[PDB]
CSV table of C-alpha atoms in Angstrom, one decimal:
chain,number,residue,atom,x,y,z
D,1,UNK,CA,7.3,15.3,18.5
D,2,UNK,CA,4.8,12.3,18.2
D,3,UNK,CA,1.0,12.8,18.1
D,4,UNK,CA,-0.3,10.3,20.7
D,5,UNK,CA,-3.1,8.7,18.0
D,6,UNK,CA,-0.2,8.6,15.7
D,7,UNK,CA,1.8,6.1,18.0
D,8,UNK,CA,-0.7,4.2,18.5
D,9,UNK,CA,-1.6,3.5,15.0
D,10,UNK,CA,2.5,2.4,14.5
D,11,UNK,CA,2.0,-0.3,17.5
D,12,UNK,CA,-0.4,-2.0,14.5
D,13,UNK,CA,2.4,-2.1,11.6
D,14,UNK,CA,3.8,-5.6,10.7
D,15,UNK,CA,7.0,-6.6,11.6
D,16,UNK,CA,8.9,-5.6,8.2
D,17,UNK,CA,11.8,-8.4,8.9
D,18,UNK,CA,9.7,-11.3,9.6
D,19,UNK,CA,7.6,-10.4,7.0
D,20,UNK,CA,10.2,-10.1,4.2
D,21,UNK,CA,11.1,-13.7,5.5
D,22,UNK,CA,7.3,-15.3,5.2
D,23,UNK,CA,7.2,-13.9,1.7
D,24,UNK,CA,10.9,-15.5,0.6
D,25,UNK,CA,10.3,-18.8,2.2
D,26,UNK,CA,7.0,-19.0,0.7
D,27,UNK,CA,8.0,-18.3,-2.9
D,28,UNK,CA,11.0,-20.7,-2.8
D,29,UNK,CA,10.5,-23.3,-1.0
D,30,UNK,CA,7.4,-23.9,-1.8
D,31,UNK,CA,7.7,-24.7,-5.1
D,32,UNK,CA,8.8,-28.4,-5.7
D,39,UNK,CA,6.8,-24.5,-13.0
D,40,UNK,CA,6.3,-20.7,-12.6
D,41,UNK,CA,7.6,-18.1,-15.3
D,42,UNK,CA,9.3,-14.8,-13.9
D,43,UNK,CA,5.5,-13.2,-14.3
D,44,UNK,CA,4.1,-15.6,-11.6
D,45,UNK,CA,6.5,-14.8,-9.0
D,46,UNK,CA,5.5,-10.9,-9.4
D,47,UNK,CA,1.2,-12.8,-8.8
D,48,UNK,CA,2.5,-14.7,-6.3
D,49,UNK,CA,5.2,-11.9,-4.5
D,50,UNK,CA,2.0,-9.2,-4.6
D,51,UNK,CA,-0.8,-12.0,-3.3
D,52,UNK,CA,1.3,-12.9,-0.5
D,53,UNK,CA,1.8,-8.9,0.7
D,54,UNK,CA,-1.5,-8.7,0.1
D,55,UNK,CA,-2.3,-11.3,2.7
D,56,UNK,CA,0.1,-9.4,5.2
D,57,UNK,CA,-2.2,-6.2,4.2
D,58,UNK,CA,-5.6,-8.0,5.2
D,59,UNK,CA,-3.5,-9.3,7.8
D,60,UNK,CA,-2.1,-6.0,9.4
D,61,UNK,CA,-5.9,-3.9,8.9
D,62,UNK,CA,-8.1,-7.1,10.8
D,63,UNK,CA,-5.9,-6.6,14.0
D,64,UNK,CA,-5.1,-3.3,14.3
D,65,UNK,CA,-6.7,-0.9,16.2
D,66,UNK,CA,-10.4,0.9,15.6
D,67,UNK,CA,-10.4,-1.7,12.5
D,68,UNK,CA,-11.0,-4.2,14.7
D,69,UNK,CA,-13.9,-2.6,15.8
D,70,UNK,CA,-15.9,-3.3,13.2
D,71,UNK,CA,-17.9,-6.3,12.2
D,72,UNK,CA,-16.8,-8.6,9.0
D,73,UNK,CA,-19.6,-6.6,6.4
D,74,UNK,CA,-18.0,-3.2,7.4
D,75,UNK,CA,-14.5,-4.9,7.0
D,76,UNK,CA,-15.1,-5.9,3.7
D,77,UNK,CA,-17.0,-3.3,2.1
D,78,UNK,CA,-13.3,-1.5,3.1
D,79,UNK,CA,-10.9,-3.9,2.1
D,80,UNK,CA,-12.9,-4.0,-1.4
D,81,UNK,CA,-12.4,-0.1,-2.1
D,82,UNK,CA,-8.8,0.1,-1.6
D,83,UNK,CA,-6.7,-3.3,-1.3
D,84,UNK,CA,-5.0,-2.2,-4.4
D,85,UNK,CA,-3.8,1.4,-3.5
D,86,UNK,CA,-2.4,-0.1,0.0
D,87,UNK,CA,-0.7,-2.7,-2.2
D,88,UNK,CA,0.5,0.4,-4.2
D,89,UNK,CA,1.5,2.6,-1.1
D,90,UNK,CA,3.6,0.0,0.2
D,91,UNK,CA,5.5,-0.6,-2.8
D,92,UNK,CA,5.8,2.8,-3.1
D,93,UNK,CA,7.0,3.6,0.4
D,94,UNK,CA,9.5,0.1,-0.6
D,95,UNK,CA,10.9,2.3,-3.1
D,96,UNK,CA,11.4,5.4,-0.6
D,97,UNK,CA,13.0,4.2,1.9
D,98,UNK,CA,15.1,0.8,0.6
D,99,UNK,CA,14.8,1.4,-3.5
D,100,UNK,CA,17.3,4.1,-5.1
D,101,UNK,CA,17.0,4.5,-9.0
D,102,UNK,CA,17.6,2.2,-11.7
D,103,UNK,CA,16.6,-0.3,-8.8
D,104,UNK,CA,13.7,-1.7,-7.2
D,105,UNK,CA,13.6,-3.1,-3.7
D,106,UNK,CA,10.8,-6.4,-3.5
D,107,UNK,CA,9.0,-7.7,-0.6
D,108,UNK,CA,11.4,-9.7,-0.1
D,109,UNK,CA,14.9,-7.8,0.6
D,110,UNK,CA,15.3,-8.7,-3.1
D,111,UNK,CA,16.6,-5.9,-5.0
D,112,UNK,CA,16.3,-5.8,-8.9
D,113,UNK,CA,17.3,-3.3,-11.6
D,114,UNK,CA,14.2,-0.9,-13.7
D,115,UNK,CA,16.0,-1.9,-16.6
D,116,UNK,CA,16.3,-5.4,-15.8
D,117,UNK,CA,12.6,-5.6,-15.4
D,118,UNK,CA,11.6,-3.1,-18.3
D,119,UNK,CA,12.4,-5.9,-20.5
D,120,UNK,CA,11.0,-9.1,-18.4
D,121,UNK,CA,7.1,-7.5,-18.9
D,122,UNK,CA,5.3,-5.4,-21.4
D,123,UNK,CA,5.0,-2.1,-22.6
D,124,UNK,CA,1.9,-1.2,-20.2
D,125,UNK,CA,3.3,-2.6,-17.2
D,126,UNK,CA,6.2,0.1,-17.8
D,127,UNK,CA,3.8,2.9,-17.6
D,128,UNK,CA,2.9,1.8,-14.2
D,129,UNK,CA,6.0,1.4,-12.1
D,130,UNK,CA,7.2,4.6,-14.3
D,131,UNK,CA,4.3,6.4,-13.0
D,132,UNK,CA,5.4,4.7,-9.6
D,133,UNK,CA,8.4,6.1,-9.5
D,134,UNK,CA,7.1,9.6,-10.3
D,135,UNK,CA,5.5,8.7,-6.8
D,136,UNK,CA,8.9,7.6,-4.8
D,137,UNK,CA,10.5,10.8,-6.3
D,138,UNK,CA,8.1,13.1,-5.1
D,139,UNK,CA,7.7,11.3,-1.6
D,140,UNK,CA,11.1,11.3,-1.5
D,141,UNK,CA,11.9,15.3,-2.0
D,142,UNK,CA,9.4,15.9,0.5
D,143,UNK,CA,10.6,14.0,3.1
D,144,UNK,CA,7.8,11.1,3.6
D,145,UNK,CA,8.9,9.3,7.1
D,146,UNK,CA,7.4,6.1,8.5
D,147,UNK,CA,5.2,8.6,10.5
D,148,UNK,CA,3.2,10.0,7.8
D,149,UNK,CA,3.2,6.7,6.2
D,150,UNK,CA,0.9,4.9,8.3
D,151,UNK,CA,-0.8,7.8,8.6
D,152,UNK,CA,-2.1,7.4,4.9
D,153,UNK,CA,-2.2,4.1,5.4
D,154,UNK,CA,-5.1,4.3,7.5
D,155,UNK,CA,-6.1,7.8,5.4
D,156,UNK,CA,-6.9,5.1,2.5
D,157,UNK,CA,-8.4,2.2,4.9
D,158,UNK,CA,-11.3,5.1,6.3
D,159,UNK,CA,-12.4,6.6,2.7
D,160,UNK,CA,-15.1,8.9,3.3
D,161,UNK,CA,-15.9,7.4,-0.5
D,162,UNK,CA,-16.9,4.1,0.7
D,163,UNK,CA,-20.7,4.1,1.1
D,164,UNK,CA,-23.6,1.9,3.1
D,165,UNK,CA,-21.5,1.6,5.8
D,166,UNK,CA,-22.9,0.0,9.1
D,167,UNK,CA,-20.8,1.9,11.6
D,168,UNK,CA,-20.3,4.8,8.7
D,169,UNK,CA,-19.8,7.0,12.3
D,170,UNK,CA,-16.5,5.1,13.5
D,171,UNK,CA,-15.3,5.4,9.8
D,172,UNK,CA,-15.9,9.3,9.7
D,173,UNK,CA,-14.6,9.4,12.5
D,174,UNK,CA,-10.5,8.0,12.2
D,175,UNK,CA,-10.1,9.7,9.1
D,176,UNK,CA,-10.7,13.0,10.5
D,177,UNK,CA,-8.4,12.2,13.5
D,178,UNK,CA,-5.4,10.8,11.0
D,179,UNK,CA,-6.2,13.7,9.3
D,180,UNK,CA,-6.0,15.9,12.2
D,181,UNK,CA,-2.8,14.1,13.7
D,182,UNK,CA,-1.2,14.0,10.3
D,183,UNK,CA,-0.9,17.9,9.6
D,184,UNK,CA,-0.2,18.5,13.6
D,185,UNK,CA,2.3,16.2,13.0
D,186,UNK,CA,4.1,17.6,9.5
D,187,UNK,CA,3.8,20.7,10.6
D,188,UNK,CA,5.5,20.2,13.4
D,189,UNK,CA,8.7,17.8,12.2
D,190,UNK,CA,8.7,19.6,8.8
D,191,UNK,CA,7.9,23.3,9.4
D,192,UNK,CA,10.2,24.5,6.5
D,193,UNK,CA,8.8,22.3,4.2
D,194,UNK,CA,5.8,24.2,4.9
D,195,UNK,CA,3.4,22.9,2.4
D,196,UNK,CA,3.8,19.3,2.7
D,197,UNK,CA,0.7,18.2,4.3
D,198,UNK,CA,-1.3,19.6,1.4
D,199,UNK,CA,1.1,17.7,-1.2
D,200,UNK,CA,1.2,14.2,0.9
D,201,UNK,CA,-2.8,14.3,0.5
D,202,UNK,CA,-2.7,14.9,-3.1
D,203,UNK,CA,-1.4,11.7,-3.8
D,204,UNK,CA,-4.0,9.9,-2.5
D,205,UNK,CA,-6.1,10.3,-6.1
D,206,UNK,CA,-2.4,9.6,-8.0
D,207,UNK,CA,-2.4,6.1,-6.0
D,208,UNK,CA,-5.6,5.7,-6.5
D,209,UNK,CA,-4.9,6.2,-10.4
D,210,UNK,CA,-2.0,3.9,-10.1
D,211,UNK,CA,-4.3,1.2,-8.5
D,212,UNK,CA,-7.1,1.5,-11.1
D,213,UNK,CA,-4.3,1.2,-14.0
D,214,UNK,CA,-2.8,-1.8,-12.0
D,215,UNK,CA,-6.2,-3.5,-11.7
D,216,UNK,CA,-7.0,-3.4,-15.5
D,217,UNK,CA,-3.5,-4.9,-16.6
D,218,UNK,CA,-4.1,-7.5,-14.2
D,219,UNK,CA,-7.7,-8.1,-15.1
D,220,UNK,CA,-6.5,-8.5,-18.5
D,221,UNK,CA,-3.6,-11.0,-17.8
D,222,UNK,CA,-6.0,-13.4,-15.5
D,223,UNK,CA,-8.5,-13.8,-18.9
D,224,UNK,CA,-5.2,-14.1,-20.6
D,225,UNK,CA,-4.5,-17.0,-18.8
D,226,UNK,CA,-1.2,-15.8,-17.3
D,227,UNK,CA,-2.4,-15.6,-13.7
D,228,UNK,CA,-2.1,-18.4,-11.0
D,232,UNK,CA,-7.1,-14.3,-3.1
D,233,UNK,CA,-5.3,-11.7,-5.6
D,234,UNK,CA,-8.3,-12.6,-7.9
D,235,UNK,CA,-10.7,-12.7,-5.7
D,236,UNK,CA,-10.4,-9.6,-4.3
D,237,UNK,CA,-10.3,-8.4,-8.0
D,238,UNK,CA,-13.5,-10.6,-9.0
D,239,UNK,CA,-15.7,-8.7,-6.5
């Protein structure tokens, strides 16, 4: 009961696996000293490089020329950063417990005390997030539906090939509610409350960006920055 754009656009998603195993490989043995805040830098700069990784190959994206690219990465690298933590937590996480990008799974408690009082307020707010996903049913399917739903912002502006752009997001948007409509009927209004999270994670993002903005001029911080100091 699979929209045919929607299938497509799940041919693009990374190999979850494979990529759990990059990420651990990368954090532990390479490194031959970081404290248990540079692991969290490193852990959320490396899925960040699978992010960049999975939108410059996939399909329509690839469409575009580097400017366009950019100018799209740079609007919402942190909310995809935050949507697939979040989706983490949905489908691998269950409470008291978070599940990293690295099959890792660590307790809330456990890491309420390893960081500060702000940082708690986010993941918190996070898990306000996974509960409400998580009530309402939020598959795979819908997943990288808003995936793509926060890769084509109709708020990104002097686009080159604005058209293209305009164009996916009203498609996903299209396929999306034929789709929950469809495989969630009795959950009637779920569409509607699946797209109003799209300003929460983009509240979560903006709140994510200014604790680590802070702890980089702090000197705490170790391509995460870079797409920060743009």
């Amino acid at each position: 009961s699979i929209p045919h754009l929607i299938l497509e656009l799940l041919k693009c998603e990374p190999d979850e696996p494979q990529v759990q195993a990059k990420i651990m490989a990368y954090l532990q043995q390479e490194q031959a000293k970081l404290s248990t805040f540079g692991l969290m830098c490193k852990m959320a700069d490396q899925t960040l490089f699978s992010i960049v990784e999975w939108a410059r190959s996939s399909i329509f994206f690839r469409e575009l020329k580097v400017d366009d690219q950019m100018k799209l990465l740079q609007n919402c690298w942190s909310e995809l950063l935050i949507l697939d933590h979040i989706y983490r937590q949905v489908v691998h996480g269950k409470e008291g417990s978070i599940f990293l990008v690295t099959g890792q799974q660590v307790d809330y408690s456990i890491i309420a005390s390893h960081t500060e009082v702000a940082f708690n307020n986010l993941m918190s707010h996070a898990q306000e997030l996974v509960a409400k996903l998580r009530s309402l049913q939020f598959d795979q399917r819908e997943f990288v539906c808003l995936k793509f739903l926060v890769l084509f912002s109709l708020d990104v502006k002097n686009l080159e090939n604005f058209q293209l752009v305009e164009g996916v997001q009203e498609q996903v948007n299209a396929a999306l509610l034929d789709y929950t409509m469809c495989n969630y009927p009795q959950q009637t209004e779920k569409f509607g409350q699946l797209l109003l999270r799209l300003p929460e994670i983009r509240a979560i993002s903006m709140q994510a960006e200014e604790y680590l903005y802070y702890k980089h001029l702090n000197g705490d911080v170790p391509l995460l920055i870079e797409m920060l100091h743009a």
